[PDB]
Amino acid sequence: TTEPEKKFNSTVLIGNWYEERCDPNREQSKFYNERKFADNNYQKYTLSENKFQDTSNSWLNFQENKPEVKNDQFITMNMQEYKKPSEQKRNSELKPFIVKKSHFDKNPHELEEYREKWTKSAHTFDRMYLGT
Amino acid sequence: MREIVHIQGGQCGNQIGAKFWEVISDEHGIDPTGTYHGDSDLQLERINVYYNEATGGRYVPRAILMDLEPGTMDSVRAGPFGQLFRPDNFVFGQTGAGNNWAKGHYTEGAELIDSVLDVVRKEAEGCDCLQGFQITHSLGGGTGSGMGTLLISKVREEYPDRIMETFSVVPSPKVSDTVVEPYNATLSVHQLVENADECMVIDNEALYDICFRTLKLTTPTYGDLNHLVSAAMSGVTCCLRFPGQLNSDLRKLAVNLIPFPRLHFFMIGFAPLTSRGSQQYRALTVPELTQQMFDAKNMMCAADPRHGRYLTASALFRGRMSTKEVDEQMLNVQNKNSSYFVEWIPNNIKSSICDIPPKGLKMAVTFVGNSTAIQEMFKRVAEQFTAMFRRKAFLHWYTGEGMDEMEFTEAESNMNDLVSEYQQYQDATA
Amino acid sequence: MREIVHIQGGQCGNQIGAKFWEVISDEHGIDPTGTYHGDSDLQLERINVYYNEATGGRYVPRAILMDLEPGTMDSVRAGPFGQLFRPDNFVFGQTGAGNNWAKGHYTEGAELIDSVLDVVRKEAEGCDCLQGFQITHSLGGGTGSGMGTLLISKVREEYPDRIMETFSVVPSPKVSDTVVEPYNATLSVHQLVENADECMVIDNEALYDICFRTLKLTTPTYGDLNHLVSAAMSGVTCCLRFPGQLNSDLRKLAVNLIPFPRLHFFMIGFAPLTSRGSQQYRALTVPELTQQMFDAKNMMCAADPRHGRYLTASALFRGRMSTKEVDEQMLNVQNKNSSYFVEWIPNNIKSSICDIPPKGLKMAVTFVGNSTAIQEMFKRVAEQFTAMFRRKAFLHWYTGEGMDEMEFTEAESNMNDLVSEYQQYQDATA
Amino acid sequence: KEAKYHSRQVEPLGKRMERNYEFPQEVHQDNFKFGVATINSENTAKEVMFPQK
Amino acid sequence: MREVISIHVGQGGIQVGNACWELFCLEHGIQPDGQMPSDDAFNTFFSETGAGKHVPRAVFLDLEPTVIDEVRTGTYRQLFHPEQLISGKEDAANNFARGHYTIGKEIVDLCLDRIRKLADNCTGLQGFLVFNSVGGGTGSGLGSLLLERLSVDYGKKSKLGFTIYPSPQVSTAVVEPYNSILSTHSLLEHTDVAVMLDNEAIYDICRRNLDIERPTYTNLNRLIAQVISSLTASLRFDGALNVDITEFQTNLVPYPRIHFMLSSYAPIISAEKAYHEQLSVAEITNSAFEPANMMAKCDPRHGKYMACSMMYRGDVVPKDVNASIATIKTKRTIQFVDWCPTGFKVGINYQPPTVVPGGDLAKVMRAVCMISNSTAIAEVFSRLDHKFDLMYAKRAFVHWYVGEGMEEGEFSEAREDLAALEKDYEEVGIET
Ligand SMILES: Nc1nc2c(ncn2[C@@H]2O[C@H](COP(=O)(O)OP(=O)(O)OP(=O)(O)O)[C@@H](O)[C@H]2O)c(=O)[nH]1
C-alpha cells in the first residue's frame, strides 16, 4: 500500500485525486448534477453546474474571498484602541460566565411588569405594642 | 446582629435555594436588581440577617452556591434573580459527581473544597456576630449528599459553638429516580447525625399529596414543590427578622425540642393552604389553623404522626392574634390526644407569636414537630439497602475509589442503632 | 529612510528576484505600470524602502540585474511585472559563464564587474541613510556563485559598516542538475564567511518535498518554488516597513542571532502552509502557528534540525494579536524541548510583532534559526569534493583560466575548518 | 398506466403503504405537532398561597 | 463544553453514521456546507472553525474505499474534514485475521494520530461512541484493535459501542459466526456499554408500525439515528431532569462483566394512523416495554430485569412518569431481579423529537427511549455458540484464518470465554 504516480486524469478514484479536483484552475473542477445524482432519465431533460467545494485559486494567501479579512487587513492596534474618548468602547474579551446578560436584562419590560406584580403588594403590617 | 449564612449544593438544593431567595426578597421588598422598593420601615429594620451591604446601596444575599457541573448553575443565573447573587460566590467544578457518593466525598469533592471553604470562611468572618449556618441539599444525589455532608464536618470543626440547619430531601420508594439511592442516602445519614444540630426531612412523596389534594391542582411541577418548602423555611426565622409578643430564635428552638443529643430529626408543615375555588369559603381563625396544623396529611413527611408518640412539638404563629386563644388551643389538643403524646414530659408543646404575617395573608402558621413516627422512613430505606448490599450489587464503583466495604457495614450499624435507640422512648413509660 | 538595495545574479537569482518583486508590488498595491492603486495610507509612508520615485508619479524598484548572457534577462523583461525595472539596470556580457567558477570570477567577471559596481554605487549614494544589501543567487552555478561572490567581496571593501544579507541556493546531492557542482560550491563558500553578515541557505530538494507533502500539488513548477522563497524573503523586512508593537530591523537580527563572528549561517521557514483541499477546516491561531513553525519538515533546508541543537532563533509574527500568547508559547516550546536548545545561553528565542499581515491572509510567521545541524549540508558537499578532486576530474578548465590547485586545497581546508569549529558547541558544557 | 394495479399503491419500494386519507387543511399543515394536546397548563402556580388578593 | 468523539468503522458503521450526522445537522440547523443561517448546544458534536462553518467530531475508518468515496463525492462533501476520512486499498473480505493481523496494523497509527489531534482540541471530553457491524471482517478486526489501543492510551474514558449482531435466521454472510465470537471476546474486556441492534427486529418494527413492506437500509438507519439523538439530547438540551454519560453505566452495570444491553423506542408511527390515537404518556411507555417493539430479537419474558435507563423527551411532566412506572411495577407479566428493589432511572428533556424531511416517521410531541439490562440476553450468545459449534466440528473455513497469520487455538479460547459469560449470566440471575 504505497503512493502511486500520475497515470489517469482527475476523474477516476485513483489516489491523490481530491487535491486536483479542489484546484479551480483545472476544467474538471466543476461537475454536473445529472452526472450522478440521477434517479431516472425522464426526470430532467436538463444539465446544471454544481462546482466542487469552494476554494481559492492560489495555494498561498488562501484567506481571500472573505470580505471581512480584506477590511481589517490595514488596522493597527493604535488605530483600534486610541480612537477618541468621546466614542470609544472596550474591546477586551472577558470570561463568558461574567457577561451572561440574565433574563431580566434581556427584556427590561418584564421588570416593571414585575415589582407591582409581587413586590410592595398586599402588605399588612400590624403591631400590638403599647406606644408604636 | 445574630445573622446567618446560606449554603446550597447539588441540583435539588439549588432549585430549593433559588426559590427561597425569591420568597425572602418579596417580604423585604427587594427587587431582583437589589433595590429596596418596600413601604414599611420594619422591612429594612433587620435586613442584616440575610443580606450584605455594598457600595452604592445595593443589597446582596450572603449565599454560597456549590456544585460539580455548570449545568444547573448556568440556568439559575440565566433566569430571574440571577443578578442578585455575587458572581464571585459561584464556585463549581468541571467533571461532575456522577451520582457517586465516594466520588463526591473522597476523590473529586475533596479536591474542590479548598476554594469554597475560603469564601465561606471569608463570609463568616466579616459578619458582626454569627448566629449559625443553614444547608439545603438532597440525600439521594452524588454531589448533594457527598460534598454536602463533608462541608458540614469541616465547618463544624472551625465553629464548634455555632448551630447548623439542614433541609434534607430524603428519597422515598414510591418516587424513585436513581437505582443507587439506598447506598448514598445511608452513607449521608451516618455523617449527618454526628455533626448537624438540626435536621429537617422532606419527601417528594408527601409534597405531591399536599399539592394534589389540599391545593387541588392537577399538574404540579418542581417549581411548585420548591415553593412549598420555601414557605416553611422562611417561617422558622420569621421571629428573628420581625418583632413579636414571644421571641424565639434558632437556639431557643433547639433547646426546647431536643431532649437527647442524638434525637434531632424533625418533620415540618405549613398552614393555611387552601385551593383557589375554596379560598372564599374559609374563615381565618386560630381554632381552624390549629386543626390543619396537626392534620396528619399536612406533614411534609411520608411518616404518619399517629403511628408513634410526639416527644415534643413547636408552632410558630404569624400575624395579629390573642395569646389566650393560642395558649388554650395548644392545651386542648394535648388533652384530647394524650395517647399520641409521651407522658413523662408535661406540656411538650412550645408556642411563639410574630407580629408580621407573610405576603398577602392575614395569618400563617409553621409547625415543627419531633415525633417517634420518623423511624419508619429509616426502616424502609435500610430495608432497600440490605437487599442490595447482600449481593454486593453496584459496589465496584465505591470500592474502586479508595473506600472499602468496612465503611458500608459500619454506616449501616450506626443507622440501625439510631432507629433502635429512637424507638426505645416510644414504648418507654414513667 | 533606512532603505535597502537589491542585487540578483544568475538564472536562479534573477528568477527569485522576478517573483520577489511581484509579491512586494502586490503587497503595496503597485500597478505593473508603476502606478499606486492602494486603499489605505499605510502603503505609501514607507514605499521609499524598496521603490524609487520618478517623474509622473511612477515608482521604479532599485534593483540591479547582472549576468554573463542575455538569455535569462530577455525572459525577465517579457514576463509579468517586467516594465518596473529600469532598462539602465541591466548589465550583461555576450558569452556566458558555462558552469565554470574561474571564468565568471577571473576572466569574464573581472572585466565586466566594473560596470555593475558603478550602478550599485550610483544607487547607494542616491539614498540618504543606507540600511544594507540583500543578494539573491545560487552557489551551484558559474555566473551566480562565481561573479556573485566577487561583487560581495568588493562591496564589503567599500561599505564595511552596512549589513549584508544573502539568500543562497546551495546544491543538494539528492537532486542533481550539474556534474561540476562540488567544485564551485566549495570555492564560493570560502569567500562568504569573511564578508556576509547573514546567510540564509535554501535547498531545492527541501522545497520539492514541502510542496509534495504539505501542499499536495501534483505537478509543481519553478514558479511555485519561487513563490515560497519570495514569501519568506518579504516577511523578514515586515517590521521595517509597517508599524507594530515590537519593531525589529535587519541589524537587530544580526546582533541577536550571532554569538560568534563565524556562526552566521541560518535556515528559514514559513507558516501557515496548508494543502488546497483542507484550507477552510483549520483555525489560524498563535498556538497553531507556533507549533508548525518549529516542525522539522517545514524548514527550507535538507538538514534535519532535530539532529542538533539550536543556538538562537527568531520569530517575526505578523498581524494584529496579543503579546501574552506570543510570549507564553516561546517559553512553552523552549521548556518542553530543552534537549534541542543549548544550555549555557538562556531564553534564546526572540519574538517580534507587526500589525500588517500579508495580503490574502490574517496571520503569518517567519522563522530564522541558527542550528548546529546546518553543517550536515556542508558535510555532503565536502565528501563529494574529495572523491572528485583526488582523481583531478574536470580540473583542466579551472587550471586553464589562471587558477591554481593551491586555492582548491585552501577551499576544502576552510570548509572542513568551519564544520569542526561549528560542531564543537553541540556538546560543549560550561 | 402502471400505477393502478393494487401493487403500486400498496407495498412500494422503501415507502409507507399508501392509505389515501384527507386531513383538514385549515389546520394540520404548517406546524401541527401530532399528539393529544399541550398538557393544558393550570392557572395560578405560586399565588394559590400568598393570594395577592 | 462537554464533547463526545464518534468513531465509524466498517460499511455498516459508515452507513449508520451518515444518517446520524444528517439527523444531527437537521436538528442543529447546519446546512450541508457547514454554515449556520441564523445557545451553543452544538458544541457536543461540532467544533467552531473560528469563522463560519462547523466541523463534526467524527473520524471515518475503512479498508475498502467505495463507501468512503461516496461520502467524499456526495451532497455532504463540504461538511466533513478532508483528512479525517481514512481509507485503505484492499478489503478484508469478511476475514477477521486480515483486519487484525495482516493489513489492519498499517492504519491504526493514522487513526490514533487523528483521534489524538481531535481530543487535544477538546476540553470536557465525556467519552467515545463507536459504530461497527460485527459480522464483517474489518468491522470486527479493526474495531477490536482500535478498542484495545484506545483503552491503554486513554485509561478511564468511557467508551460506548452500538454493535449490530447477526440475526437469528435472516442473515447475509455464511462465515460470520466465526469472526463474531473473536470480536465478542475482544470487546467484552475493553468496552463499557454494548447495544444490541440485530436486523430482524428492525424489520418487524417497520412492517408492523410504518406499514412498510419493502424496507431498505435507509429506513433502518433512521431508527438508530433517532435512538442516538434521544440518548444524547440530555448533553445538549436543558430539561427538567438531566442525566450525563457517566450517569448511565454507574446505574446500568451491577457487575463489571455484565454490560450488554438492548434498547427500545416509542412511539414509532406514521402520519396516517397517529391521528386516531392520542399518544399519551401513559400509553407510549407501555409500547416501550412491549416485547414486540424491541430493537433486539430477544424475548424479555424469558428472564429477569436488572435496571432500565429510560429517557423521555418532549413535553412530559415528572408527575405522569411516576404513575406509569407504578403501573409497570404492579403489572405481573414483568418481573425484576430480587436484589434490586428500585430499578428505574428516569430522565426528562424539553426538546421534542425532530423529523427529517422525506422520512417515514411522524412529528410527534412525545417520545421515550429505553435502555434495558436484562438476563434474557444470554439466548443470543447461546444460539451463536451453537451455530459456531455446528461448523467448527470439522474445521470448516479455517484455512482462510490460519493462512493469514492467526494461530489455531484462538477459537477454543473464545469458546471458553463465551461459556464463562453464559455461566456468569446464569449464576447472577438466580434467586437469593
Ligand atoms: N443495519 C445495517 N446493517 C448493515 C448495513 N450495511 C451492512 N450491514 C451489516 O453488515 C454485515 C456485513 O458486514 P458489512 O458491514 O457489510 O462489511 P464490513 O463490516 O465493513 O466488513 P467487510 O465486508 O470486510 O468490509 C451484514 O450482515 C449487515 O447485517 C446497513 O446499512 N445497515
Ligand SMILES: Nc1nc2c(ncn2[C@@H]2O[C@H](COP(=O)(O)OP(=O)(O)O)[C@@H](O)[C@H]2O)c(=O)[nH]1
Ligand atoms: N424538590 C425538588 N426535588 C428535586 C428537584 N430536582 C430533583 N429532585 C429530586 O432529587 C433526586 C435526585 O437528586 P439530585 O438532584 O440528582 O442530587 P445531586 O446529584 O447531588 O444534584 C430525585 O429523586 C428528585 O426527586 C427539584 O427541583 N426540587
Ligand SMILES: Nc1nc2c(ncn2[C@@H]2O[C@H](COP(=O)(O)OP(=O)(O)O)[C@@H](O)[C@H]2O)c(=O)[nH]1
Ligand atoms: N528555485 C529555483 N531554482 C532554480 C531556478 N532556475 C534554476 N534553478 C537552480 O539553479 C541550478 C543551476 O544554477 P545556474 O542557473 O546554472 O547558475 P548560474 O549559471 O550561475 O546562472 C539548478 O540546479 C536549478 O535547480 C528557478 O527559477 N528557481
Ligand SMILES: [Mg+2]
Ligand atoms: Mg465492507
